Amino acid sequence: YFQSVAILQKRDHEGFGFVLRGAKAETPIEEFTPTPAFPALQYLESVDVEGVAWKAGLRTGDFLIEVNGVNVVKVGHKQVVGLIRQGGNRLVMKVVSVT
Amino acid sequence: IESTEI
């Protein structure tokens, strides 16, 4: 996987245009060991072809490493969603991707 | 494993 950074800016009532997927904090995230093939707990299940994230170059399969400066490699699903939500209309993400 | 639209 290769790292990239995307800065997403949206309007109040739209989304950023992706579905996030990964393990909830009730799984033993304390035991998660990143590997090259599975480098972070949360990844992109889909990216809306009409949306902000698509235009920033994000694609299905990208693994989420950082949200607004906070590393999320070993962070549970609902907690990562909360970190994204708290940024409002701007999201600075770092991901690792097959391309 | 959970999924959420963002």
Swiss-Prot record, chain B:
Annotated effect of mutating S3 to G/S: Abolishes interaction with SHANK3
Protein family (similarity comment): Belongs to the LZTS3 family.
UniProt superkingdom: Eukaryota
Subcellular location, record wording: Synapse; Postsynaptic density; Cell projection, Dendritic spine; Cell projection, Dendrite
Outcome of swapping I6 to A/G/V: Abolishes interaction with SHANK3
Residues of the full protein shown: 698 to 703 of 703
Protein name: Leucine zipper putative tumor suppressor 3
Protein species of origin: Rattus norvegicus
Known partners and oligomeric status: Interacts (via C-terminus) with SHANK3 (via PDZ domain). Interacts (via coiled coil) with SIPA1L1. Can form homooligomers.
Role summary: May be involved in promoting the maturation of dendritic spines, probably via regulating SIPA1L1 levels at the postsynaptic density of synapses.
Entry comment describing in which tissues the protein is expressed: Detected in brain, with highest expression in brain cortex, caudate putamen, cerebellum and hippocampus. Detected in neuropil (at protein level). Detected in brain and kidney.
